[PDB]
Design a binder for these strands. Sequence first.
DNA 1: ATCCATATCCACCTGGTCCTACTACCAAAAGTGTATTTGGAAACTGCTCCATCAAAAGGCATGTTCAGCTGGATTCCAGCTGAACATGCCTTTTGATGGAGCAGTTTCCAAATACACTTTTGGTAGTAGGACCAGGTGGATATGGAT
DNA 2: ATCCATATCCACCTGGTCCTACTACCAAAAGTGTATTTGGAAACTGCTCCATCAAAAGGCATGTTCAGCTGGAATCCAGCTGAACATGCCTTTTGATGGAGCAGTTTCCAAATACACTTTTGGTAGTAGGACCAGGTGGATATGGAT
Lengths: 94, 93, 106, 106, 97, 96, 84, 78
Amino acid sequence: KTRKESYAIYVYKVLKQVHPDTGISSKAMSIMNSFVNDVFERIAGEASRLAHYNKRSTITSREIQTAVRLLLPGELAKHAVSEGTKAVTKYTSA
Amino acid sequence: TRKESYAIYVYKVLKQVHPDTGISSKAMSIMNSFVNDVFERIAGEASRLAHYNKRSTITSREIQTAVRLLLPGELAKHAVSEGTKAVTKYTSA
Amino acid sequence: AKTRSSRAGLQFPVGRVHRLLRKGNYAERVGAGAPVYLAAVLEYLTAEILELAGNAARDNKKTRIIPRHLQLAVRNDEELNKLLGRVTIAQGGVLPNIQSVLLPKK
Amino acid sequence: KTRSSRAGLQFPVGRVHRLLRKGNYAERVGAGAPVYLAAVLEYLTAEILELAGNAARDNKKTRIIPRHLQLAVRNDEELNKLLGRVTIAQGGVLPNIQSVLLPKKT
Amino acid sequence: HCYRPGTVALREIRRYQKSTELLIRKLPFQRLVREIAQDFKTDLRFQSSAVMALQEASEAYLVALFEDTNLAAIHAKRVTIMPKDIQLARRIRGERA
Amino acid sequence: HCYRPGTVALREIRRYQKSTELLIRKLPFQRLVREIAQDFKTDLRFQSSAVMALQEASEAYLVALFEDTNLAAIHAKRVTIMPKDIQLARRIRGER
Amino acid sequence: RKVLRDNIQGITKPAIRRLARRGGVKRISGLIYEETRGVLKVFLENVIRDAVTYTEHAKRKTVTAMDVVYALKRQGRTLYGFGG
Amino acid sequence: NIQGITKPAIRRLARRGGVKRISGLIYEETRGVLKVFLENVIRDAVTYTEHAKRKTVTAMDVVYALKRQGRTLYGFGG
DNA sequence: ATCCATATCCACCTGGTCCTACTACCAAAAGTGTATTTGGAAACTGCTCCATCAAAAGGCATGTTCAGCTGGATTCCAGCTGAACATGCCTTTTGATGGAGCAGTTTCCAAATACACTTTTGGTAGTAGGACCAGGTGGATATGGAT
DNA sequence: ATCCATATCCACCTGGTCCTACTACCAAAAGTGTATTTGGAAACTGCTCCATCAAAAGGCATGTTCAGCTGGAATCCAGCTGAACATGCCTTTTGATGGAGCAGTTTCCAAATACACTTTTGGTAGTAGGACCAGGTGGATATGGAT
Ligand SMILES: [Cl-]
Ligand SMILES: [Cl-]
Ligand SMILES: [Cl-]
Ligand SMILES: [Cl-]
Ligand SMILES: [Mn+2]
Ligand SMILES: [Mn+2]
Ligand SMILES: [Mn+2]
Ligand SMILES: [Mn+2]
Ligand SMILES: [Mn+2]
Ligand SMILES: [Mn+2]
Ligand SMILES: [Mn+2]
Ligand SMILES: [Mn+2]
Ligand SMILES: [Mn+2]
Ligand SMILES: [Mn+2]
Ligand SMILES: [Mn+2]
Ligand SMILES: [Mn+2]
Ligand SMILES: [Mn+2]
Ligand SMILES: [Mn+2]
Ligand SMILES: [Mn+2]
Ligand SMILES: [Mn+2]
Ligand SMILES: [Mn+2]
Ligand SMILES: [Mn+2]
Ligand SMILES: [Mn+2]
Ligand SMILES: [Mn+2]
């Protein structure tokens, strides 16, 4: 049986972080899976178009950022750009 | 820089269609934008097709199914016949 | 010897649309027939739009196509109007259409 | 040590990387792109799960169901705009009656 | 006689606007799907979740359409939705054109 | 006078429906574009083709919005477009 | 197998009334229902087609939930909850 | 600036749209709508310009921005 | 119906913005020869889940009655908004000059890829066991609406 | 403002759903380490085209007057649609089964990739010729509309 990967483990971790005494239903978790896969495809697609427009063959963190700014509305874009920058600086700091 | 365009080919098809008519520069640019647009649509639909079925190759079948998904009815049938015809002539060549 | 579009009986470049399919990151591999099919479809749609636009051009007592003629061709054909339902033809204008209840005599 | 721990994230950096190259969005994918993308995805999940958990608490429930995800999405202007063309299965609709439909003057 | 015309309608608006259940009976919708699909291609089978997905999408689209339509009726100073309202809505959102 | 109200209005409906020229004066539209862009990035310059493209898309969008707006006014048994017609069209469209 | 006919009338007047109620609609004219069915017929026809176009491309005879999700997404009405 | 788009111009645009009579309040609402439209489009276009590390908004930036806004435009590249 | 005042159109005319032909050059695009790799079609079949049946029953559709009130028709008039002028503001243009900076070129290195091994882990499945909530009840309270 | 026929709300409760929890395994995923390749940042800068004047020309926006005709308010009333009811049907639910067909696994070759090498061509760039058509003129006539 071929494995069917998903984001449910990670969605559950970030769920127990925000509301530690709150569970989630199978259907609701499925909606969360579709949400993460969806946003993933939107971001990576806008970044693909971005790299193609500027004749670059590499998708870097910068294209992901510009894609976030193009895709997410105002405040979500600001906080998402913040957390992304923080994550890549912490990553490269090692 | 070599700025590629579909201009000469569109003009030649125009000569096959209306041999005594011309085309303005802005209309030509509109035609180029249309060819590029339809190209990106069919190629993107085909890419999503090959991905949905865990395939690694875009074959003429993918292009055909994408044409059935993008173009309206009669345009879809005519475009499909044109495609299969060109592939048939190219194969027996 | 002879170009691939000539062997396919096409006016649109098979090799070019093949190269573009490769560089466009659509798939890891591109079969030899996909650029033939795609080039044929593009040539056909170009032939349709240029045909109806040419008919509009001759109907307007002109010999070379302007954006207005492309717009008249697209917006008067149901299926081309559906295909280009979300695109704006620059310098195309709109079709002559006055709502009937705005005409004179009430 | 995983790259997720290396970046201070719960979401899988390696999986986001492998998915980024598996979906051929470009020829190459830099090392920071999956870190940034997994970070953004994790932030969005945290946001919607916060608002939805509050929706469940308001309805005196301890388990989030699609109704709570819908209430969270459609009441947050930004999340609603982000998912403007998305329908959440079993999400229902926001209670909203147009004021003119309400009774008045006995 | 007990409730003036409109009261039970508002009661129903609150009831269904508060819940998430599907409002079209399952089996008739399944038959409709198998008919429409049977006319496109014979000898087709469906996963149960495919029919339920078509259910969800159809009811969501129809509910949103009924909201835009209700706005169309109210715009004409009417409480009653009418076919001209649906046609105005679908025409504005580029569904019919 | 001469013509009754609404006649030369029809005359101009026909006039501007036959033509394809742009209807907003170039320079004020260019100033508007530069002012709006200044809020997002400073010391920005524009290719002329970018400004003309913005004007094509803008006037197309507005003409279509006046089509749907006029339809909204006619739905309420009226002939004069009013702000609530634009609002209804933008809400149905999914913009508002 | 028995021939399937007139199943659009299976979308009953009470069901259309419930859908309208969820839409916040208070009064419904008698000609709405048929109209609704018409609109509904146009909707399913346009998704199911694309759905089976996927099903036929994968050389399958069973329409999956994923085919419906792909068809709905390419129609612009992407649906969460059934995969993808 | 936004008042530089005059009432006569808005009238001509409405007439191309087939409008016969125009309310006096239409012009302000129209200026607002146009300003929102240009704000979104120009926002995305300037995002493209900044990503390209440039200081000149090109017609292709406007074309890409318009395309992702769902309002693709033929005749200026692409 | 008469006919005055504009709007509108058709035939014709010409400058000029604008299209095709022709010559030259060259990087790159495209084809061809050939050698290696491999995606995925064929064949086989395990195993999921789909179509179908049966039976029981009650949730809910159907069809009817009755009348409350909503839409539509009618009428009217206050007042906005269109139509034409009179100003004269400020776009349009076009000619031309700086010079910003887009964009072509050449270096060169931090980073990405390719490959090989090793360790980790997320997913599936089998078995077993709690707990949140849907549905049901019964009474208290709240609401529509007749009086 | 009072009193009743109904709906609504809540605490309490229980079935049996929904979810969670260990054990076990492992094939895929992910990390680590070296070696090789290279995309694209940086520095330079040539030349394209963008900003800014200058400076009339007059096109067109603006303010104003007047009144036509339109939007919106006020009334009336037919018949449409909501509400309630009685009946009974066909959908929902529970359980079972054959077998179609989805999908896992292995073989194997046509077809795609990778590279070297040759040929062809489309794009740029001048320089030069040509012509379709926008804009203007006369003059005919159809048209909106007041008598
Ligand atoms: Cl990176
Ligand atoms: Cl192929
Ligand atoms: Cl109607
Ligand atoms: Cl208004
Ligand atoms: Mn049939
Ligand atoms: Mn001449
Ligand atoms: Mn293989
Ligand atoms: Mn019955
Ligand atoms: Mn009324
Ligand atoms: Mn410089
Ligand atoms: Mn584990
Ligand atoms: Mn309960
Ligand atoms: Mn009371
Ligand atoms: Mn119990
Ligand atoms: Mn290099
Ligand atoms: Mn008067
Ligand atoms: Mn009126
Ligand atoms: Mn009566
Ligand atoms: Mn019975
Ligand atoms: Mn079998
Ligand atoms: Mn050549
Ligand atoms: Mn010449
Ligand atoms: Mn002329
Ligand atoms: Mn007359």
